[PDB]
Structure 1
Amino acid sequence: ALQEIEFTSHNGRDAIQAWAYEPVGTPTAVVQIIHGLGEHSRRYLHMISALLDAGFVVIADDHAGHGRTAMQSGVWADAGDNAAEVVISDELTLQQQLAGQFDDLPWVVFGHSWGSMIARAMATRPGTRLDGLALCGIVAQPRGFETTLDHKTLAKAMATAPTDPAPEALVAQMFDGFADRLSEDDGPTGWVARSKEVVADHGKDKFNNFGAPMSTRFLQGLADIYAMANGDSFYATMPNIPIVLFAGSEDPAGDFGTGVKAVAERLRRDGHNVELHLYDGLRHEVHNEPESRADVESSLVTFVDRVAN
């Protein structure tokens, strides 16, 4: 069965476009997919079908400024003021759309990229439905967020022109070093996947519209959520539930595996239950990379079944 869900965003502007997918028979879990920057939930058709095949309910929305939400509002790469709280609030609202349908079932959040940051921030909030946390394309200690992005210049832009397009200089700082292991023929979004076919399709997909100029307030939202996901308060408040991590060793977002190993090691030192899948030689979208997609999906099913046990 298919449900179309719409609700007003926390930003009061966007009709959030959302879908629930129910398998045949009696489902054993709910998986909530949280897409990343400059993409959309219906890009996950393969994964959704694999999870339905496993007996899970899947629920996903196109965030503020993204996908069909952007296509219907006409607003791309902006989510309103307090953009981090908007997209966190809307992912909570999404859970409430199934209230009284699957209340007895375990609930896993799978977040990719910006989605890994939204999933991490969500996790730390009381009231969130969360029995297991799965993170993919994990943004963790990249040079751009950690050091290159100039908080003083951003703060001046936030004070004077929050809703205007983000200055190019600031945007470049956020992506600093993302092309450090690419060739010229990989193109500037070569970091998305080793597979040129995956990258080509990413750049064609009208529901991605990747590279729509972001607003200054949307860039502040990325810097806010980064600090919410990688900050001391994340580690201090992460609940004692199973966690699984999927990343490419060749992904700049996770500082070429170094950032992702540090997340795993800090969670482990703090006594957490952590499963790490670090794909050697693969780039950001290990769930879309033809070498790793089957392994990510089968590990994700195994993980949801373990949460359920």
Structure 2
Amino acid sequence: ALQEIEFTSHNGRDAIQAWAYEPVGTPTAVVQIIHGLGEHSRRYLHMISALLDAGFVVIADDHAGHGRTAMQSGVWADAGDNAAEVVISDELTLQQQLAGQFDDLPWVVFGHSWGSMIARAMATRPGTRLDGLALCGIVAQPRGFETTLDHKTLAKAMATAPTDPAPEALVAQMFDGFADRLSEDDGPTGWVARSKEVVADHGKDKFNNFGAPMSTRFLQGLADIYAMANGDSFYATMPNIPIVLFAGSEDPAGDFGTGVKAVAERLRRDGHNVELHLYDGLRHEVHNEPESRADVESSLVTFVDRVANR
């Protein structure tokens, strides 16, 4: 069965475009897919179909500034003022669109890239449905967020011109490092995947519209959510639930595996239930890389089944 869910964003502007996919039979879990920056939720068709095959409900939206939400609003790569809180709020609102339908099922959030940061930030909030946490394309300790991005220059841009296009230098600082292991054949988005076909499709897909200029306030929202996802409060408040981590060892977003290992090591030192899948030689989208897609999906199904059993 299919549901179209729309709701007004926390930003008061966008009609958030959302879908729920129900399998035949009695489902055993809900999986919420939270897409990343410059993509959309219907890009996950293969994973959605795999999760339905496994007997799970799947629910996802196109976030503010993204995919169908942007197509219908006309506004790309901006989520309003307080962008981090807008997208966290909207992911919590999405959970409540199934209120009364699946109240006794376990709920797993799967978040990729920006979605991994949103999922991590949601975990710190009391209202959240979250019986397991699955992260992919994990943004953790990359040089740009950790060191290159000049917070004083960003604060100055926010004080004077928060709705202007993000200054080019600040965008370059935030993603400093993303091209470190790329050739000119790979192109500027080669970090997306080792698969040239995945990268070419990424650049073609009209519901990604990747590369639309971000506003200053949107860039502020990425710095904010990076802090919320990677800061002490995340580790201190992470609920006592199963966690799984998926990343490419060549993904700049996780500092080429080093950052993802640090996330796993800190959660494990504090006694958390942590499963780590680091794919050697693969880049950001390990759920789309032909080499790893089947292992990511099967691992995710086994993980959701383990959450449901507990």
TM over 0.5: yes
Residue 177 (structure 1) shift: 1.0
Structure 1: gaps of 5 or more residues: none
Alignment RMSD (CA, Å): 0.3
Q: Name the SS for the 2:185 alignment partner.
A: helix
Pairing of 1:52-63 with structure 2 (within 5 A): 52-63=52-63
Q: Name the SS for the 2:156 alignment partner.
A: helix
Q: Name the SS for the 2:286 alignment partner.
A: coil
Cross-structure match for 2:173: 173
Alpha-carbon separation, structure 1, partners of 2:108 and 2:180: 34
Residue 104 (structure 1) shift: 0.8
Alpha-carbon separation, structure 1, partners of 2:65 and 2:127: 25
Structure 2: gaps of 5 or more residues: none
Cross-structure match for 1:82: 82
Q: Is 1:301 the counterpart of 2:301 in the alignment?
A: yes
- Give per-residue Cα distances to partners, 1:225-269, cap 9 Å, x unaligned: 000000001000000100000000000000000000000000000
Residue 100 (structure 1) shift: 0.1
- Give per-residue Cα distances to partners, 1:16-70, cap 9 Å, x unaligned: 0000000001000000000000000000000000000000000000000000000
* Deviant stretches of 4+, over 4 Å: none
Alpha-carbon separation, structure 2, partners of 1:132 and 1:268: 15
Cross-structure match for 2:249: 249
Residue 272 (structure 1) shift: 0.4
- Give per-residue Cα distances to partners, 1:160-204, cap 9 Å, x unaligned: 000010000000001101110011110000000000000000000
Q: Name the SS for the 2:18 alignment partner.
A: strand
Alpha-carbon separation, structure 1, partners of 2:220 and 2:275: 31
Cross-structure match for 1:117: 117
- Give per-residue Cα distances to partners, 1:114-167, cap 9 Å, x unaligned: 000000000110010000000000000000000000000000000000001000
Alpha-carbon separation, structure 1, partners of 2:52 and 2:78: 32
Cross-structure match for 2:142: 142
Alpha-carbon separation, structure 2, partners of 1:180 and 1:79: 29
* TM-score, L = length of structure 1: 1.00
Q: Name the SS for the 1:166 alignment partner.
A: coil
Alpha-carbon separation, structure 2, partners of 1:267 and 1:85: 24
Q: Is 1:29 the counterpart of 2:29 in the alignment?
A: yes
Alpha-carbon separation, structure 2, partners of 1:308 and 1:83: 33
Alpha-carbon separation, structure 1, partners of 2:40 and 2:155: 29
- Give per-residue Cα distances to partners, 1:275-298, cap 9 Å, x unaligned: 000000000000000000000000
Pairing of 1:15-54 with structure 2 (within 5 A): 15-54=15-54
Alpha-carbon separation, structure 2, partners of 1:133 and 1:155: 32
Alpha-carbon separation, structure 1, partners of 2:124 and 2:307: 18
Residue 103 (structure 1) shift: 0.3
Alpha-carbon separation, structure 1, partners of 2:267 and 2:104: 28
Alpha-carbon separation, structure 2, partners of 1:295 and 1:175: 28
Cross-structure match for 1:10: 10
Alpha-carbon separation, structure 1, partners of 2:177 and 2:53: 39
Alpha-carbon separation, structure 2, partners of 1:304 and 1:124: 21
Residue 9 (structure 1) shift: 0.1
- Give per-residue Cα distances to partners, 1:71-100, cap 9 Å, x unaligned: 000000000000000000000000000000
* TM-score, L = length of structure 2: 1.00
Cross-structure match for 1:164: 164
Q: Name the SS for the 1:186 alignment partner.
A: coil
Cross-structure match for 2:189: 189
Alpha-carbon separation, structure 1, partners of 2:28 and 2:249: 33
Alpha-carbon separation, structure 2, partners of 1:249 and 1:114: 18
Percent of counterpart pairs with the same letter? 100
Q: Give the number of aligned pairs.
A: 309
Alpha-carbon separation, structure 2, partners of 1:152 and 1:280: 37
Alpha-carbon separation, structure 2, partners of 1:101 and 1:263: 34
Alpha-carbon separation, structure 2, partners of 1:109 and 1:92: 11
